[model samples]
Target chain A: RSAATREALITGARKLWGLRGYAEVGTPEIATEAGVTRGAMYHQFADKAALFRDVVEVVEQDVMARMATLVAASGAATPADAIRAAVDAWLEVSGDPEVRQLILLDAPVVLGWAGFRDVAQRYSLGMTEQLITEAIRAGQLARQPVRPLAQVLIGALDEAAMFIATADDPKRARRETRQVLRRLIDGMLNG
Target chain B: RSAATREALITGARKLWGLRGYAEVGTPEIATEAGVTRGAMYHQFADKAALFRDVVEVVEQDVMARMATLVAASGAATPADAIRAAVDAWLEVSGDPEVRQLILLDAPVVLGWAGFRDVAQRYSLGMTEQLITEAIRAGQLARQPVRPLAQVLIGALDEAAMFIATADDPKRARRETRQVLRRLIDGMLNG
Candidate 1:
């Protein structure tokens, strides 16, 4: 019963944080949304900030899982093909209002920039680390260290998504952004 | 005198916000740091948020100015050379604690993502857009539309800077990022 209530609260918080901005959210409201009382909310999570940290972890997990699934679903023939498919998938997922707000807008500020970077190491950073390994295993990429490339590319994908999300016509922005990513990845693979 | 007082307050706030991180700062400390009364602080700026916004603008102006000056100072011969000079200079600027904090970490959450995006447009985005013209005119870049390429590239640089800032040996991270950025930039210019 105790664990269930806590899980319920976390589940509710994700929706609230996702659909609405974090500033607009409060403990009372989150408890209400979760169908629990404020007492139960405290028992489960320490405070709003604490609960938010958990929310961040959960979202980070989902993002990494989604990206992996995307590459496989892409049915890509080569590492470059897989990366392109994954980039497309990244843009698609990035369009989600929840993903954009919770991770991009809120995470760095709320978690502290350094804290958020740690969380990213679990997901975005790790994913790209995996990406480089696959690319090399397939003999698709030239020799290079893994961590730096994976880490920075996460930054590249992040900003690229923001560019697409905010464009006048996201449609046009998405196409153009992916084209750039294709070329950028080609350079990485080549060098 | 009034404008000077306001400028003093902004300077104090930037130091406070950058040193302590944004959420840890308060209006009273800022006034104290500026050697002014709380009322004077209020008189000069509408609120803490407002003062921070001004600080961001002041920094953005300096950053753009600095990058342009850096490029010219480098005596870059080609468009690629100019872009490299500018990028090298940006990485140097990004190494500063104030630039890393107030601009990279704080501004987006404080001003809202769209708000930060607008800020980037006036300076970071605009500079890169200018880069494209020089590249095209120099006959360095082969083919691509201007706006999307420029915008996304800004994201790449922004992210890359963060990577460089947070690494264990920032010196090494800086070198690695520039190498990949070279490849990334080359692909854009050549293709």
Candidate 2:
């Protein structure tokens, strides 16, 4: 399949996935949205699930790559700084409507829990643990277990993003989310 | 309508709302689930949306009543302890699958943002704000802006509950959720 055709299919799939959930959307509708024939879509991707997998891959790449940049940019910072920076980046990314809807709501249904777990463990949780462990090592974090703490912190931020994403006023959500993040970061460092 | 019939309808609506969400579930399913006919369902409530409104009302009542009990139970020695107790109570209530799904997911869809905003302003937000205000008055919390902080904190907890409820392992989710809540409460008090 040509690159243009593949891109079209992925875009169409994301749109359908966002508007209605994965179960409700079909290949024909996706093909029509992509402005491609059904045969072409089939030629590009084996099936709807395969196409959906591609969508998940794209989102995963985009999300992880963005986090990597944020972490890299926070040079010479304490582990606490790195953790806060990473969470801020996540909230920024998740605040986007496309990213928010796709990852939080639609991606799980399309990719399933195992797929999300794999990505979360490899990319999300792994990054969080690394930063958090570094903080504990640097004496910035308290002498508690790191993995559970990382999960709690990350989970809280994730939920905050969902609230902000679904809010009637996205700007207010962002501001309030920053406050929540700030308070959480401050608490961890001080406590 | 008799109290028994109303209670039955609420129970059935809660169950159906958990499974299919507000937009997907119909009145007949709720009626059938409650062991009542369609006419009986309508006789008890005006329509599906009306039934959902009552569902939100019931949830709010239960939540507020529980929170009031928690607050009243706490001694006057430490307002921060009351806040922590409230967080604990929130985690307990939100951990319930039926309550989490109905309040977090289904209610917003069925009641719409307007309804949600109204309820939040009148009930959830008001209660949270009042608690924050009391804590501040008691010098337990810093005199930072109260309303936004309350909203952010409550919003974060709500999002956390959604994550735990939707996860594959409820046990892990709950443990991590409690950790997150602890961090959040600690942050607000000490940060």
Candidate 3:
């Protein structure tokens, strides 16, 4: 019963926050939607921010999980394939408007700058650094400081996703961004 | 008196908000710092957000002006010099922790995503696209969509600045990021 209540709270908060945003959705509203009482909501979370953090974590983990599968499968296939797959996977996942709102926009404000960065470090940033490290060893990219390079590439991809997400013609924006990502990655090569 | 009050409000708000952040500082504190009455504060601006917008604009414009000078000087000097100068100028300007706190961290939340992007478009992003266009025309870089390439490159630089700003050893971090930026730009070259 305890586990079910907790899951219900998280699932309900995720749907509400994802659709209406963190600021607009109240704790009472979330509890009502979850089919639980306000007492249940308070018992499950210290406050709204804590609940929002958990919701963001769930969303980010889902993103990271899918991206990891794509990267691992591609890594096994070929040297060239891993990098392309990794970048494409990032775009595909982050481009979801729901994900864009929850993880990208709302999290940064609700979680604070360092807090937001900490979450990214554990998931998206950490994954990106690993890709760069392997590419360096495989002679795919020129030898360089791994952390700095990874952060820079992630920044580019992060902004590119935002650009696509907010564009008037998202389809065309995605097409342009993909080509740009290819060039940026290609430019990083040792060749 | 009217002009003086507005200038004092902007200058005072910029210092306080830049130091303590937008959320923490209030209109009364800003008025106190500016040596103006609270009535003067409301008289000059609609509210806190209105005041913050002006402060951010001032900071952004200063950054753009300095960067513009560097780019123009570099363009007159040589083909390779302009791109290098542009990237370095961005690092130098944004690396200031005050600028990072105000423009990078606070603006997005306070101004909203689209509002923040609009400010950047008028200043930083606009200048970057102009640089990319010239680079392509000069045969310095491979032909590609100028806006997309510029946006991608700006993303890389923006993240790099944040990394440098937050590092325990900023000097070393700056050195490492500069080297990474060099490689990324070099990779984009036609040669």
Per candidate, chain B TM-score? 0.90, 0.78, 0.87
Ranking according to TM-score, highest score first: 3, 1, 2
TM-score of each predicted structure versus truth: 0.83, 0.69, 0.89
Predicted model 2 interface RMSD:
5.7
TM-score of 3: 0.89
Report the C-alpha lDDT of model 2 over A1-191, residue by residue, as the tens digit: 57888999998888778667677889999999998998899999999889977887787678889887977786845677777777778877787666776777665555654465456556677777777778878888766656556655665665566567667887877786687678768876842
User: Lowest-scoring 10 consecutive residues by lDDT in candidate 1 chain A?
Assistant: A182-191
Q: Residue B55 CA error for candidate 1 (Å)?
A: 3.0
Native-referenced Cα lDDT, model 1? 0.81
Interface RMSD of 1: 2.9
Which candidate number would show the highest DockQ if scored against the true structure? Answer: 3
lDDT digits (tens) for residues B80-143 of candidate 1 = 8888888899988888888888887787668765577679877877778888888988788756
Give the CA lDDT, 0 to 100, for residue A59 in model 2: 75
Clashes of each: 0, 0, 0
lDDT of 2 by residue, B108-171 (tens): 5555433554575577777788778888897777776665576556656665666676678878
Greater lDDT among 1 and 2 belongs to 1
User: Which CAPRI tier for candidate 3?
Assistant: medium
lDDT of 1 at A41: 88
How does the DockQ of candidate 1 come out?
0.43
lDDT of every model, 2 decimals: 0.81, 0.73, 0.83
Question: Which parts of model 1 are misplaced by more than 4 Å?
Answer: A20-35, A105-112, A137-139, B11-38, B46-50, B96-118, B137-139
